[PDB]
Design a protein around this nucleic acid. Sequence first.
DNA 1: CTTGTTTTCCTGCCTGGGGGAAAAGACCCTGGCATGGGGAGGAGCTGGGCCCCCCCCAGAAGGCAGCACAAGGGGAGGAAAAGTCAGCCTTGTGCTCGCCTACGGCCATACCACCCTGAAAGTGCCCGATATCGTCTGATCTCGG
DNA 2: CCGAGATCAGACGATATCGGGCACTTTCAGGGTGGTATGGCCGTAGGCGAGCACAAGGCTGACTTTTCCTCCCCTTGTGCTGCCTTCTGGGGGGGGCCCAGCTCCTCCCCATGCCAGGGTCTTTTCCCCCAGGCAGGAAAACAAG
Lengths: 99, 99, 93, 95, 108, 109, 82, 82
Amino acid sequence: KPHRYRPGTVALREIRRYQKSTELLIRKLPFQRLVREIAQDFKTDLRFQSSAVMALQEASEAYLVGLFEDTNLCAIHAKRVTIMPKDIQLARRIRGERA
Amino acid sequence: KPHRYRPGTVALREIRRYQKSTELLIRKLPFQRLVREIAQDFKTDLRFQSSAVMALQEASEAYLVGLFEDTNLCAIHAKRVTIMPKDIQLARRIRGERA
Amino acid sequence: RSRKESYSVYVYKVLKQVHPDTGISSKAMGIMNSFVNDIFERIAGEASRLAHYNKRSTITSREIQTAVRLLLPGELAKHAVSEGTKAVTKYTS
Amino acid sequence: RKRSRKESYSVYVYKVLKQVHPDTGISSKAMGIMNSFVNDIFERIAGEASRLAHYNKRSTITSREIQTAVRLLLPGELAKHAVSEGTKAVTKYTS
Amino acid sequence: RAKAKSRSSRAGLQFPVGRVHRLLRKGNYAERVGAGAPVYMAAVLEYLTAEILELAGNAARDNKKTRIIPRHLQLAIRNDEELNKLLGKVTIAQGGVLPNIQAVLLPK
Amino acid sequence: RAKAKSRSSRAGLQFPVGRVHRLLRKGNYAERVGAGAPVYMAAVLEYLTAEILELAGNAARDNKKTRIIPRHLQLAIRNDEELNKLLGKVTIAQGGVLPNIQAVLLPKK
Amino acid sequence: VLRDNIQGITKPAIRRLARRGGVKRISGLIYEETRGVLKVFLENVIRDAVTYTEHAKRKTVTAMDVVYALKRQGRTLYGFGG
Amino acid sequence: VLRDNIQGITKPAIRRLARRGGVKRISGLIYEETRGVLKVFLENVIRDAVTYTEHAKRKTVTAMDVVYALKRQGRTLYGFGG
DNA sequence: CTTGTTTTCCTGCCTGGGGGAAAAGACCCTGGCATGGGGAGGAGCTGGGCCCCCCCCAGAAGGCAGCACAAGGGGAGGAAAAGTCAGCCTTGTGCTCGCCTACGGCCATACCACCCTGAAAGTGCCCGATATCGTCTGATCTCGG
DNA sequence: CCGAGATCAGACGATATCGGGCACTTTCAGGGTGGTATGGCCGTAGGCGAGCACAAGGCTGACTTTTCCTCCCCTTGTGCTGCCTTCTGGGGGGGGCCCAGCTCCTCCCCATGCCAGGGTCTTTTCCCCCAGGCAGGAAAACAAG
């Protein structure tokens, strides 16, 4: 049979790859569509400076990357390796987003 | 043999009694003596308004209660009821006071 | 001899307008004056930042309205904006 | 017609860069970030000094207020060195 | 309004339009302050006043008390979801905390 | 030192004392701005800029690069303990994150 | 761009974000929670950016509007100006 | 007051503070850990307040100095002036 | 412990695109001069923070019994991960249009500054009336049998 | 499901302290008038933001295997809780004292305001060097015998 990697080594390879890089991980167009759909609920016929959408993408990705670091710590505290939604809820509650 | 309360009931009664109260839960003189000790390393021969030491006390006692209110969640997340130093450390790190 | 000013002659006139049965303690009055002093600074600072962003040198009502919208939650902002607009509309004419 | 001119710290950041590290350049995005950093800590210190001068009912922002704002805003060694360099700059500007 | 009286009465408020204007002018927020800014601010502040005083009076009446203490203000602020979001980083002195026990810490 | 020249060269700074004074004057901070307040701020900002531009230069030299990019500044800021405290709530665009793996999430014997 | 655009932050993208965050294993329900979290955060930031745009009497949301909105919530962003 | 008043925060006091936070069971190291946490926080506050005190050329630490030091850290305090 | 198998780093070559220096200009910092005004300084008053003493009893400290919960260990299953394979939709390029934001010029009306007066509110004095303490039962919760 | 025993809850006598109201004042808000300068309105332009073909190919969506991680149950002993007794020290009252924080009057040095002038900072060109891409080779972990 061909060569197959043991579960959990490609995960660390991806961790190192995406930590050594500075690229944006969400594709630009699906996020731009999300931003435009969200802003319509606030005001219709809204134009977006491309730099504004890019700034929103960078801020959102920074937020999610920082939140996953608080989630991984909760998952390690609970004597686990896998992160679940309860970890995200606890991290948000403690940091002050759910009270 | 005399009557005895099973463990946990007195703790819950104390929780109910101290959550319905408003008074200060730290003795005033031992806290004033600690404030007048911390201030010396910054500036000597400092005077201290009673209002100032009261403000410090009612700020620290709301900091510590709010911190234990997060340590309790950090203990419950690990399928526990006892609160341990690791819970306090995790709560503080997620809050941002330890990073 | 000096005198100090506080929102104690005005909070106790709204308290007797909304609940004309209950009183208020000195410590509660101090807390409720600190609340007004904090919210005033919040709104005024946000309006100042807005006016500086838009290269204006005058703090109008349309800056206070935007500061209120930014600073307060949904229903609180909706009611505060309407109260301010009613007061401004009656004051002007 | 003409286009309105913009102002930034991109002439002084580069001057400091060539003093502390003579042979390395700086990219445009990095210069843009270093332009927002200076503005951010300028606004922080200026606001702290303004509130400081309002607390003691003073109308003038002075090196005293700037020094106290620096001591209140920066961590230990950063505040020590910033206060020392600012005091040296003020002493040399006066002498 | 055409009647020439105090500016708070002219606006229908109970908060001081004059001293709010003076505080806006001498607080160094902008070089100029409009005429309707104090009126708007003394109507937002007076509404935020009656939103907390009403709930604190409700809390005081709920405990057979005819006076409002810091505990009543804390109860009102922390029980109202919007006011707890506004004053989320504010410590009410001598206010205590809401009565709250996690359901996992109760006997089964 | 007594001179008739630019106030930046009179104080020994590379940052604009005149611009810093003008921004303080038109920033609505106080009615009056003293003579030594712009000199103090133009030196505090210069020291902080020098600190970051030295740490980021070190980081860029550690990556075999002649040019400073946002990743180098992010590395400098998050690797300096006293600078990470000053910029703890700040996002650096295209700065990435500090590489780190928890000791639990690693292969064992 | 009117309906069902939240399913554009795909499972691989959320996996890469967690990998950069140091996450070694992910449960299958994490994605529908991270999407809600991202929607809430974006709805909080854009709500203030649009308020700034309306106050400026403009019809285009600018990078300065986004940067100021982010700065308001204690999430200062360096790089796009300000 | 010169030496070792951090133990003036007795274990019953820490237990009462824990009970007011909804804590049912406490380990035997929470007391030392909490004393450390209390000292770290008081050191920040009674330093940011003494900074104001020496800026006002005063030797007494007034309640307003403490209130401003708490406000500048995000922990606004109502009731002690302001 | 080896050998085979992927993935990563290294190095040389090619290339392109963007950063650093030069050039013209324009605009704001500086120098000079006159002027008001805030605060630095020297008194004075007195409020309050510090120090001391005496008393008590309320709470902390130590100990003992004992029990229930944290933690280690074993087993089961199910559910992410890793690897293929097919299609789709992102992105880069290029082309087109027109809408909106910014600049310029003009002016008008709104805000600052100043001069006075009066009335609002800030402080002090005083009185009553509500919150609390204390004792007595009444109800409810907890735990053994 | 049963009966004791502790603990909280309600209620009335009462007592002091603190909220609420009345008078003096004093100090700040408001009316009237002058002046100017900021912001609103109209007009112009062009920059950039939106919309549309067209690949192609990298990326995403789906199916299979399976391993290992999460979850549950058991058991032990250890650390936590609960109650009793001791003794200390925190809380309270009363007095004395001296320093420090607030106020007031002088005036004088510092900050401000305005005009003339240039030297420093801004924007546009451009070119050459540093960083990106890519192909071939060596090294390095990784896993199955």
